[PDB]
mmCIF file of N, CA, C and O in Angstrom:
data_model
loop_
_atom_site.group_PDB
_atom_site.id
_atom_site.type_symbol
_atom_site.label_atom_id
_atom_site.label_comp_id
_atom_site.label_asym_id
_atom_site.label_seq_id
_atom_site.Cartn_x
_atom_site.Cartn_y
_atom_site.Cartn_z
ATOM 1 N N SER A 1 -11.362 -104.457 -43.872
ATOM 2 C CA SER A 1 -12.246 -105.628 -44.320
ATOM 3 C C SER A 1 -12.668 -106.358 -43.400
ATOM 4 O O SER A 1 -11.802 -107.410 -42.661
ATOM 5 N N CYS A 2 -13.938 -106.559 -42.633
ATOM 6 C CA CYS A 2 -14.401 -107.287 -41.760
ATOM 7 C C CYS A 2 -16.028 -108.050 -41.873
ATOM 8 O O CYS A 2 -16.080 -108.229 -40.714
ATOM 9 N N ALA A 3 -16.253 -108.115 -42.827
ATOM 10 C CA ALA A 3 -17.145 -109.071 -43.397
ATOM 11 C C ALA A 3 -17.706 -109.739 -42.986
ATOM 12 O O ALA A 3 -18.060 -110.449 -43.880
ATOM 13 N N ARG A 4 -17.314 -110.371 -42.009
ATOM 14 C CA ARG A 4 -17.127 -111.925 -41.203
ATOM 15 C C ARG A 4 -18.562 -112.321 -40.519
ATOM 16 O O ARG A 4 -19.106 -111.275 -39.967
ATOM 17 N N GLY A 5 -18.641 -113.478 -40.568
ATOM 18 C CA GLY A 5 -19.693 -113.984 -39.390
ATOM 19 C C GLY A 5 -19.690 -113.386 -38.027
ATOM 20 O O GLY A 5 -18.783 -114.226 -37.268
ATOM 21 N N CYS A 6 -20.268 -112.803 -37.224
ATOM 22 C CA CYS A 6 -20.747 -111.690 -36.224
ATOM 23 C C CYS A 6 -21.355 -112.212 -35.633
ATOM 24 O O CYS A 6 -23.138 -112.848 -35.786
ATOM 25 N N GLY A 7 -21.321 -112.472 -34.261
ATOM 26 C CA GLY A 7 -22.183 -112.558 -33.510
ATOM 27 C C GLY A 7 -22.720 -110.963 -32.795
ATOM 28 O O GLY A 7 -23.917 -111.461 -31.796
ATOM 29 N N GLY A 8 -21.908 -109.981 -32.903
ATOM 30 C CA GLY A 8 -22.304 -108.860 -32.399
ATOM 31 C C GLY A 8 -21.245 -107.907 -32.944
ATOM 32 O O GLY A 8 -19.975 -108.129 -33.579
ATOM 33 N N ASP A 9 -21.428 -106.735 -31.872
ATOM 34 C CA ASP A 9 -20.149 -105.453 -32.997
ATOM 35 C C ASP A 9 -19.033 -106.066 -32.025
ATOM 36 O O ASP A 9 -17.917 -105.509 -32.767
ATOM 37 N N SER A 10 -18.816 -106.878 -31.151
ATOM 38 C CA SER A 10 -17.602 -107.515 -30.905
ATOM 39 C C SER A 10 -16.667 -108.522 -31.938
ATOM 40 O O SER A 10 -15.743 -108.344 -31.762
ATOM 41 N N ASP A 11 -17.568 -108.261 -32.899
ATOM 42 C CA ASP A 11 -17.011 -109.398 -34.107
ATOM 43 C C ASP A 11 -16.417 -108.158 -35.275
ATOM 44 O O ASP A 11 -16.128 -108.599 -35.860
ATOM 45 N N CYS A 12 -16.924 -106.804 -34.993
ATOM 46 C CA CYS A 12 -16.744 -105.833 -35.719
ATOM 47 C C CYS A 12 -15.612 -105.084 -35.706
ATOM 48 O O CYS A 12 -15.984 -104.599 -34.773
ATOM 49 N N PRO A 13 -13.950 -105.344 -35.780
ATOM 50 C CA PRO A 13 -13.344 -104.640 -35.380
ATOM 51 C C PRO A 13 -13.326 -102.939 -36.316
ATOM 52 O O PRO A 13 -11.900 -102.485 -36.045
ATOM 53 N N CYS A 14 -14.253 -102.929 -37.324
ATOM 54 C CA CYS A 14 -14.057 -102.283 -38.051
ATOM 55 C C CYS A 14 -14.922 -100.888 -37.357
ATOM 56 O O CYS A 14 -16.019 -101.032 -37.630
ATOM 57 N N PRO A 15 -14.056 -99.549 -37.509
ATOM 58 C CA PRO A 15 -14.809 -98.490 -36.806
ATOM 59 C C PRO A 15 -16.057 -97.955 -37.417
ATOM 60 O O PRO A 15 -16.018 -97.838 -38.453
ATOM 61 N N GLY A 16 -17.541 -98.257 -37.234
ATOM 62 C CA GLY A 16 -18.549 -97.408 -37.886
ATOM 63 C C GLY A 16 -19.806 -99.013 -38.553
ATOM 64 O O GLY A 16 -20.255 -98.613 -39.060
ATOM 65 N N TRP A 17 -18.677 -100.230 -38.342
ATOM 66 C CA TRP A 17 -19.325 -101.316 -38.759
ATOM 67 C C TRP A 17 -20.740 -101.718 -37.743
ATOM 68 O O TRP A 17 -20.636 -101.337 -36.547
ATOM 69 N N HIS A 18 -21.719 -102.651 -38.492
ATOM 70 C CA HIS A 18 -22.481 -103.110 -37.416
ATOM 71 C C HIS A 18 -23.100 -104.402 -37.810
ATOM 72 O O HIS A 18 -22.899 -105.054 -38.811
ATOM 73 N N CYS A 19 -23.486 -105.062 -36.891
ATOM 74 C CA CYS A 19 -23.754 -106.859 -36.846
ATOM 75 C C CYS A 19 -25.511 -106.351 -36.744
ATOM 76 O O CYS A 19 -26.019 -106.435 -35.875
ATOM 77 N N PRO A 20 -25.896 -106.930 -38.271
ATOM 78 C CA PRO A 20 -27.489 -107.092 -38.338
ATOM 79 C C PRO A 20 -27.836 -108.285 -37.540
ATOM 80 O O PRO A 20 -28.890 -108.146 -37.400
ATOM 81 N N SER A 21 -27.410 -109.315 -37.713
ATOM 82 C CA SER A 21 -27.667 -110.539 -36.938
ATOM 83 C C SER A 21 -26.711 -111.489 -36.519
ATOM 84 O O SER A 21 -26.042 -111.758 -37.107
ATOM 85 N N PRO A 22 -26.485 -112.020 -35.111
ATOM 86 C CA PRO A 22 -25.897 -112.990 -34.980
ATOM 87 C C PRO A 22 -26.093 -114.602 -35.475
ATOM 88 O O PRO A 22 -26.590 -114.730 -35.327
ATOM 89 N N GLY A 23 -25.019 -114.211 -36.254
ATOM 90 C CA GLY A 23 -24.675 -115.330 -37.525
ATOM 91 C C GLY A 23 -24.431 -115.215 -38.792
ATOM 92 O O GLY A 23 -24.076 -115.847 -39.138
ATOM 93 N N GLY A 24 -24.627 -113.347 -39.083
ATOM 94 C CA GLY A 24 -24.570 -113.177 -40.610
ATOM 95 C C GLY A 24 -23.411 -112.846 -40.784
ATOM 96 O O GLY A 24 -22.533 -112.760 -39.635
ATOM 97 N N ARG A 25 -23.137 -112.143 -41.334
ATOM 98 C CA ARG A 25 -21.784 -111.053 -42.134
ATOM 99 C C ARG A 25 -21.661 -109.988 -41.942
ATOM 100 O O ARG A 25 -23.208 -108.931 -41.416
ATOM 101 N N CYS A 26 -20.773 -108.775 -40.790
ATOM 102 C CA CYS A 26 -20.821 -107.645 -40.386
ATOM 103 C C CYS A 26 -21.310 -106.861 -42.032
ATOM 104 O O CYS A 26 -20.872 -106.972 -43.069
ATOM 105 N N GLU A 27 -21.547 -105.850 -41.354
ATOM 106 C CA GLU A 27 -22.243 -104.649 -42.010
ATOM 107 C C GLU A 27 -21.407 -103.137 -42.050
ATOM 108 O O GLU A 27 -21.458 -103.124 -40.727
ATOM 109 N N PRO A 28 -21.097 -102.113 -42.900
ATOM 110 C CA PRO A 28 -21.078 -101.179 -42.885
ATOM 111 C C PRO A 28 -22.139 -100.454 -42.324
ATOM 112 O O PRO A 28 -22.394 -100.329 -40.670
#
């Protein structure tokens, strides 16, 4: 589970996830 405040893919350690917008939460 890594739906956290992401600034990019580098904040998503979950394989297959994406960061929609720098500042938002990561999405699968």
